[PDB]
Amino acid sequence: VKAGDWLPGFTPREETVYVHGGVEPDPLTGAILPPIYQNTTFVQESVENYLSKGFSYSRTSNPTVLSLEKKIAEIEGGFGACCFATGMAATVTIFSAFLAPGDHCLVTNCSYGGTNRCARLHFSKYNIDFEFIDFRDPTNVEKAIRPQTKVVFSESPCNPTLYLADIEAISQICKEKKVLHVCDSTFATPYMMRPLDLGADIVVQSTTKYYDGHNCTLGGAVISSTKEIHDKVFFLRNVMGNIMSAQTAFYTLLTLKTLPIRVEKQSANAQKIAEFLSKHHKVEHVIYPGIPSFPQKELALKQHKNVHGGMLAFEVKGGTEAGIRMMNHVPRPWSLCENLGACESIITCPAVFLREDRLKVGITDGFIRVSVGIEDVNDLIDGLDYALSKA
Amino acid sequence: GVKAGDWLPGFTPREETVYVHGGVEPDPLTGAILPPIYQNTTFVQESVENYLSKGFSYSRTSNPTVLSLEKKIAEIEGGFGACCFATGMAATVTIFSAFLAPGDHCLVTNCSYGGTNRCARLHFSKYNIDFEFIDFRDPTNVEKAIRPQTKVVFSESPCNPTLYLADIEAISQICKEKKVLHVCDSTFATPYMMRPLDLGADIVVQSTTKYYDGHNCTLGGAVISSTKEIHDKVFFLRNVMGNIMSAQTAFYTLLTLKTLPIRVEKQSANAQKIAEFLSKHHKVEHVIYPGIPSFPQKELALKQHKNVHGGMLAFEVKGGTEAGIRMMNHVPRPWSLCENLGACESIITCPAVFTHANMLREDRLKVGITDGFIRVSVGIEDVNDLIDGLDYALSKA
Amino acid sequence: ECGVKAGDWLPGFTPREETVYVHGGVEPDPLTGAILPPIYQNTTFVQESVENYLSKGFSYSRTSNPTVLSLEKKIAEIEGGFGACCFATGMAATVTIFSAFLAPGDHCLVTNCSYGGTNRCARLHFSKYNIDFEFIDFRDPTNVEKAIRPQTKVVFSESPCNPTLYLADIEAISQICKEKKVLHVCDSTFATPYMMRPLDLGADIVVQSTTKYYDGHNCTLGGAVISSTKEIHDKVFFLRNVMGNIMSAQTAFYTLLTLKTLPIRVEKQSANAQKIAEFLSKHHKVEHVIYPGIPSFPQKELALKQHKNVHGGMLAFEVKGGTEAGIRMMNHVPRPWSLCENLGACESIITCPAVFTHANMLREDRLKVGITDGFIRVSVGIEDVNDLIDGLDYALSKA
Amino acid sequence: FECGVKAGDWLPGFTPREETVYVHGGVEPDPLTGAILPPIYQNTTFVQESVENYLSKGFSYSRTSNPTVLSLEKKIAEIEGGFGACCFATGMAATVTIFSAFLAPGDHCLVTNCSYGGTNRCARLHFSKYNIDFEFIDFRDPTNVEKAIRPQTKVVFSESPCNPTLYLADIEAISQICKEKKVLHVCDSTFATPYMMRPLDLGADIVVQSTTKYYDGHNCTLGGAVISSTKEIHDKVFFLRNVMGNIMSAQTAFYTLLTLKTLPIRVEKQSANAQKIAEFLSKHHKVEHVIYPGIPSFPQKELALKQHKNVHGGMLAFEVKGGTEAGIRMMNHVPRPWSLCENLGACESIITCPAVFTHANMLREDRLKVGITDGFIRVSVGIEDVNDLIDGLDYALSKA
Numbered sequence A: 001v002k003a004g005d006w007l008p009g010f011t012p013r014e015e016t017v018y019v020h021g022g023v024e025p026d027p028l029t030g031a032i033l034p035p036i037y038q039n040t041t042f043v044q045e046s047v048e049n050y051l052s053k054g055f056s057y058s059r060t061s062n063p064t065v066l067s068l069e070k071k072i073a074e075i076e077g078g079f080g081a082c083c084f085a086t087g088m089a090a091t092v093t094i095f096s097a098f099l100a101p102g103d104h105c106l107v108t109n110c111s112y113g114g115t116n117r118c119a120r121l122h123f124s125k126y127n128i129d130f131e132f133i134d135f136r137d138p139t140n141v142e143k144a145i146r147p148q149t150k151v152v153f154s155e156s157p158c159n160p161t162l163y164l165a166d167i168e169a170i171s172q173i174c175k176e177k178k179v180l181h182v183c184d185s186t187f188a189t190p191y192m193m194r195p196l197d198l199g200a201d202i203v204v205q206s207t208t209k210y211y212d213g214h215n216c217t218l219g220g221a222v223i224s225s226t227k228e229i230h231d232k233v234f235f236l237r238n239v240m241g242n243i244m245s246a247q248t249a250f251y252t253l254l255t256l257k258t259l260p261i262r263v264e265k266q267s268a269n270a271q272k273i274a275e276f277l278s279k280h281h282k283v284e285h286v287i288y289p290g291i292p293s294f295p296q297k298e299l300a301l302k303q304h305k306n307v308h309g310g311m312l313a314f315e316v317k318g319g320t321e322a323g324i325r326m327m328n329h330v331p332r333p334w335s336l337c338e339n340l341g342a343c344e345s346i347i348t349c350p351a352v353f354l355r356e357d358r359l360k361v362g363i364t365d366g367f368i369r370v371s372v373g374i375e376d377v378n379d380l381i382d383g384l385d386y387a388l389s390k391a
Numbered sequence B: 001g002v003k004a005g006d007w008l009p010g011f012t013p014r015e016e017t018v019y020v021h022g023g024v025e026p027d028p029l030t031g032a033i034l035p036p037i038y039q040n041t042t043f044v045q046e047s048v049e050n051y052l053s054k055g056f057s058y059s060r061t062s063n064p065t066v067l068s069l070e071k072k073i074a075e076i077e078g079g080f081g082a083c084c085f086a087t088g089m090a091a092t093v094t095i096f097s098a099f100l101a102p103g104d105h106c107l108v109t110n111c112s113y114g115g116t117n118r119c120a121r122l123h124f125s126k127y128n129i130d131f132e133f134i135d136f137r138d139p140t141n142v143e144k145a146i147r148p149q150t151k152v153v154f155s156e157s158p159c160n161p162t163l164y165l166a167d168i169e170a171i172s173q174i175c176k177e178k179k180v181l182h183v184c185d186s187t188f189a190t191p192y193m194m195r196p197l198d199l200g201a202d203i204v205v206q207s208t209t210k211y212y213d214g215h216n217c218t219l220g221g222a223v224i225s226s227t228k229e230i231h232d233k234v235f236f237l238r239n240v241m242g243n244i245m246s247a248q249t250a251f252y253t254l255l256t257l258k259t260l261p262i263r264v265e266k267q268s269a270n271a272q273k274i275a276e277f278l279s280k281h282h283k284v285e286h287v288i289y290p291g292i293p294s295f296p297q298k299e300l301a302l303k304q305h306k307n308v309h310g311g312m313l314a315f316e317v318k319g320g321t322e323a324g325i326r327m328m329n330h331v332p333r334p335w336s337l338c339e340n341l342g343a344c345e346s347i348i349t350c351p352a353v354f355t356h357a358n359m360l361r362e363d364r365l366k367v368g369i370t371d372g373f374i375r376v377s378v379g380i381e382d383v384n385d386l387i388d389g390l391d392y393a394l395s396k397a
Numbered sequence C: 001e002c003g004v005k006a007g008d009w010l011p012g013f014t015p016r017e018e019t020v021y022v023h024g025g026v027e028p029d030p031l032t033g034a035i036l037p038p039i040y041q042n043t044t045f046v047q048e049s050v051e052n053y054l055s056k057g058f059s060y061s062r063t064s065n066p067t068v069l070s071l072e073k074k075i076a077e078i079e080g081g082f083g084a085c086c087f088a089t090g091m092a093a094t095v096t097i098f099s100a101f102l103a104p105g106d107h108c109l110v111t112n113c114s115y116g117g118t119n120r121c122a123r124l125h126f127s128k129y130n131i132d133f134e135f136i137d138f139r140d141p142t143n144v145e146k147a148i149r150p151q152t153k154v155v156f157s158e159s160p161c162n163p164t165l166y167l168a169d170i171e172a173i174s175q176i177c178k179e180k181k182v183l184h185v186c187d188s189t190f191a192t193p194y195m196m197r198p199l200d201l202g203a204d205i206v207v208q209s210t211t212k213y214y215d216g217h218n219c220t221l222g223g224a225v226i227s228s229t230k231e232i233h234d235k236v237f238f239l240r241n242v243m244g245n246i247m248s249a250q251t252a253f254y255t256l257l258t259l260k261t262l263p264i265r266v267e268k269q270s271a272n273a274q275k276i277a278e279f280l281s282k283h284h285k286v287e288h289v290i291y292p293g294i295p296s297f298p299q300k301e302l303a304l305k306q307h308k309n310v311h312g313g314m315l316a317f318e319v320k321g322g323t324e325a326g327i328r329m330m331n332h333v334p335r336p337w338s339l340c341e342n343l344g345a346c347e348s349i350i351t352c353p354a355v356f357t358h359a360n361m362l363r364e365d366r367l368k369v370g371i372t373d374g375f376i377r378v379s380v381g382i383e384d385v386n387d388l389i390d391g392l393d394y395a396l397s398k399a
Numbered sequence D: 001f002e003c004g005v006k007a008g009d010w011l012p013g014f015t016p017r018e019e020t021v022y023v024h025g026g027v028e029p030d031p032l033t034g035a036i037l038p039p040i041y042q043n044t045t046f047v048q049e050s051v052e053n054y055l056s057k058g059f060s061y062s063r064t065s066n067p068t069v070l071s072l073e074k075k076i077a078e079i080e081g082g083f084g085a086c087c088f089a090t091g092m093a094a095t096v097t098i099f100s101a102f103l104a105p106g107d108h109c110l111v112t113n114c115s116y117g118g119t120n121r122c123a124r125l126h127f128s129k130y131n132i133d134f135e136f137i138d139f140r141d142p143t144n145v146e147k148a149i150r151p152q153t154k155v156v157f158s159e160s161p162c163n164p165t166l167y168l169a170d171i172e173a174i175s176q177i178c179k180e181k182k183v184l185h186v187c188d189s190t191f192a193t194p195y196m197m198r199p200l201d202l203g204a205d206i207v208v209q210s211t212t213k214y215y216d217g218h219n220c221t222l223g224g225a226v227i228s229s230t231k232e233i234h235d236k237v238f239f240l241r242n243v244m245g246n247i248m249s250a251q252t253a254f255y256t257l258l259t260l261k262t263l264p265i266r267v268e269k270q271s272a273n274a275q276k277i278a279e280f281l282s283k284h285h286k287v288e289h290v291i292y293p294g295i296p297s298f299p300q301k302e303l304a305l306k307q308h309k310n311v312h313g314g315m316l317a318f319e320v321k322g323g324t325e326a327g328i329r330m331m332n333h334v335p336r337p338w339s340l341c342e343n344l345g346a347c348e349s350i351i352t353c354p355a356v357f358t359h360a361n362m363l364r365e366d367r368l369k370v371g372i373t374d375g376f377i378r379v380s381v382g383i384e385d386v387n388d389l390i391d392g393l394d395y396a397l398s399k400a
């Protein structure tokens, strides 16, 4: 083999896949990065050679988006991947493809609020029955499955309570029951957990959070384990017109190269911050998979690779008013906003951004979600200490 | 005392002024004449109490650049509001997802855009929604087919690719009398030639990919709503389905929309000349263009078309499918053999051999797509080069 | 006849003007068929071997880039030159000209009412290199003939001039410089190739600020040097690599998009400008109007000989009442007008050089370069001309 | 620590630590919208509200200044520890602006003889035509710089580490010498990055950066930066950048603002991988010499540990046994994940041989005078798994 070739029998290791996976220099010019195909249509050789070069119209497929999809499928370990404008678009495409009137769908009751509301308020009007259950015990999944059940939709770790779901056990249950297991691994990243290695049928990802990790783009990704699922997803994406654009795909191809080192820094910072918070006299409870008080420490040790993530949560003593004061006084470098998984550490209120339906979802009084970034951990802890001084 | 930066109080801007400036003012912070690109996911909040005080939180729900474009588009189309989407298909599917439910009936023109038709029949009907495809050239047919289950009447004019016209005013009168939502896709028309919201339509769907862009650069869609209620439901469902337009695409479209009037004027003058040339060419059987006397709906065209008759035309070659294939395989530069329309670059397509090549012949003659039908999207090149290329190609058929 | 197929031009085809603006120097992407050139937003290019170094034509984006190269071939075709080199700004292009073709002890003739950037560039920077710049009247070519020295290497003309709209006979000056064997460089930013191509008229080098009409949307900055011979082009290319002022791929993509509508943009701008100049010429508050399309124009013979299709989107006038009247007018110019510094855009722009850009310079020099006290520069856009005239009328009512 | 600041403010008197500055320096949420990232002002001109309020909002024309570029410039000035900074289309543009602003006919300028080939070519092929004398000397000894200073000397242009021999220059001693002799000190710290060495901290007057390499670190954009220690130097550079029309674009500034946030962790990973790779290469039968500041064989190890912070860098060099032919064989058989190209400092590992690619048309004596031997290989270590990089290098050396 010569320059530009991978060694025969090569299995690139993880970080190599994040830097190089599924992307090669441009054949025409040798450009080390994939050029941006900011372009609607593609000229055909003739009528008989329609699609001979692989492209026709950017709503159906785009070369930059295709390069990103190949990289994403390689990173998550699936057959194929389809990229979308947003993570909600990926979720909605899954629900549109695999649910018909009369079908049943099991969802984790602490899913992302957008997923829950899109199921509850929109798709329910098509006479699809969504049942929200506790995924912490896989036996609940096994006993709630009906003959009409098509999709089991898990999420691990959960937004924002950080509950874990045993992806391997749930997937075994679903294979025995012949139902599609879809897993939302946005909080974990493939660097900490790949549900496809654990038997899941589909992975859904909001690339907005960690794939980007720069507060730059929006994006979604559906990673399919087989060709049939992938082809159904691709067809429906073309039908619904929610494909990701070439510029976003270029941004994400760039940002994905640093996901491992970013997540390593974020999870080290998060470990230190969780320990600090767990020894703080104004903090009632701290949720982080890496500290011994984590209720699902056994599952986290079984399921998490490399790290325990940049996401944590905590409750301030005194409830809603103390939490609101603290968040109103959290100083820079923190940012009080709605995203997560970025270089910029973010602090959020889930509720104030009915308590009867929220206390059942785990978001109790004074629940604070923390997305740790890559700043100096001491500056972050200084800001947190000052903010807690106002609680 | 009107000063620099203000509009004169009682002076409504005219059309081209609206296309250049509509709904976009210089950046308050810096004075930037173009609004900056908010290539940015999230927006910092001043406090928990002052949530959304500056109007933004998350770009999937709303983005400042996208919002500027939406204000310009709503101004140009003459509606209350607008929501911009990643594609035109996204906008159409958002309409269908918002206003249809199992058991409802929806009327669509049988010569709709292929994507609209395929989206209805292969996806939404699995939700037990009945889509009936009737001929919209006679509004009394729409008046007949409306039932108590009917919720949406989906018209298109001019139609892709047959350029059939629908009388938006008469159809809107019908739907208003019958209390049913009239949605019109005027992508082929552009707001410069026809504004369905002026003609009584309740919703307009646009694929900004075509003429709003006009440069083969971006994908995009738009839903322009006549009332606050329709706009609010479209906005909510767009946030739910995550198919909003990107900020970079919105910037591109804000740039290209400024030249839509002159672009469409050049394209339509070129198209008139090309249609006349084709109509007096011996290897051409039929020519379809609203601006030549042989157009079957000349009365409606003169009634509801403004300024121009469009850059789209169509024609049939003598000898049918094989002759059309030969000709299209021999259409030289400056022409492009591809799938888009409405761009500065002139484009030749065969919907029977490219878009509906997998479709059977028996049902493609019902869409009016004869085999040998050729869709022409005229660009802004010198019309003599375009005619020379067409003549060379026709010599091969 | 022939047997060319789709994607081919007819044999020996010479595209007409507008066709060159839409398609010139750009073919679909050979790899994918993409109708537009993809953006090569990347720094370095991988080589397949030591032997095949540069075999695919690219190594490093500072030296050259595929998107920039597409734009450069298009611009060379549009201006009718051998080659083109694209730069980050128009001033970058001009500075590269001056850096390449002047040395200590050399003489260079510049039009006295040149653009302020070129004048400042020569007087405040390059003069330090013992290059002697002389600023003369270019409205009479015999002035150019009489000012040429044995040490002269460059004659830098500009037509129409920024902002006086003075013209220069590019053909006669080109004849003079050919006779005495000195390089003729011409800045035709204000004209655009759609109105005047100096290389057609015997110029050796054309300099363009693509920021203005090439862009025409107030979006990007950019410059271009178009060379009539391979030797000049190679010198410019080498120095552009040395100085690191190449245009970026994103800017090149923007300009490739915007250039496609320059003909229709300029047609609309010039029709609007003709109507606006005719309106202002009759105006109570207006002292003079300067536009090549009205009989008032002093150099109308040269304009009719030298201008193709249009007389441009630029005009200028003088408000009666001096600097205070100018200031009142500017302070009350309403939308759709904009009070700013660019020109050639779809958005109509208006400004007064004496109180904004040239406020620091002494009145004697302003009058020396023809910029009177009430001088107003007007870049006409593509808005409805009636709204523009209404705005001008109100602003003048406050004068 | 008893104050009353709230969300959006820094703590009073706060000086953030290094990584915090890389993420947040020079940048705050957008006042209009709260946008956490600076919007891209893809925009030429800026409307003025009045004749009297001209420039009251800070901007007029993007060739002179642009808000995105200014945000990046503030971040860079904070990161390098300087008064001000101006950003340019390329690094060569930054260097060219320095040479244009501070040199006149008859002036003398000392340049490190192993400077980046572009700077050397810039000096000899273009600026020397203005009767500016450029003398190229060995900067590894500050006494050489002091003895080589002439009455007409105005600029001393150091580089450390130098492209590509990785020679070091004692920035602090050279700065002391220049400050005594009242001469400008410009330092090209492109290879080092501010994360490893900040020459303004060590007394330099001007820092020149190619943001193309490590600031970007993604093979994405070109750019340059001039960081000035005083307002006077900064104003001179600003004025001349407006004259030269070589300012950075807003889009490039946005890209670089994005990528600068990960420079610390990127450089940490790159330098750890580079330490391992240099050891593995110090260790090979086909390798004659390895040059990396982090291994004991480095000739300037003492200066390296005095001057370098946190890391020893992602750049290394070595020389294969067997000269140009073995070097060519290895280069022709360097497999993925390596790339054979001309940039450096990126996430993608890059390898090249200057004597056969960029300096191939250069005389051999001229190359050996700069220390570019026949088997000389320049290695830019990325952030891939170091074992894959080592396997690729081992396969390539097997075919040498």
Ligand SMILES: *Cc1c(COP(=O)(O)O)cnc(C)c1O
Residues within 6 Å of the ligand: A086, A087, A088, A089, A112, A114, A115, A155, A159, A184, A186, A187, A206, A207, A208, A209, A218, A219, A220, B060, B242
């Ligand atoms: C944010 C999020 C989503 C939605 O992705 P978007 O890009 O915002 O549409 C889905 N799932 C999870 C777990 C998320 O955190």
Ligand SMILES: *Cc1c(COP(=O)(O)O)cnc(C)c1O
Residues within 6 Å of the ligand: A059, A241, B087, B088, B089, B090, B113, B115, B116, B156, B160, B185, B187, B188, B207, B208, B209, B210, B219, B220, B221
């Ligand atoms: C092309 C087209 C569409 C689809 O719009 P996209 O932007 O391609 O998704 C819808 N309607 C009509 C009339 C069209 O021509």
Ligand SMILES: *Cc1c(COP(=O)(O)O)cnc(C)c1O
Residues within 6 Å of the ligand: C089, C090, C091, C092, C115, C117, C118, C158, C162, C187, C189, C190, C209, C210, C211, C212, C221, C222, C223, D063, D245
């Ligand atoms: C504006 C202008 C220039 C300078 O070009 P920039 O892109 O602004 O640097 C040069 N010449 C003329 C005639 C101009 O109008």
Ligand SMILES: *Cc1c(COP(=O)(O)O)cnc(C)c1O
Residues within 6 Å of the ligand: C062, C244, D090, D091, D092, D093, D116, D118, D119, D159, D162, D163, D188, D190, D191, D210, D211, D212, D213, D222, D223, D224
């Ligand atoms: C690459 C480089 C430069 C030139 O910077 P560009 O961005 O390529 O113009 C200058 N100095 C050093 C040390 C370099 O490595």
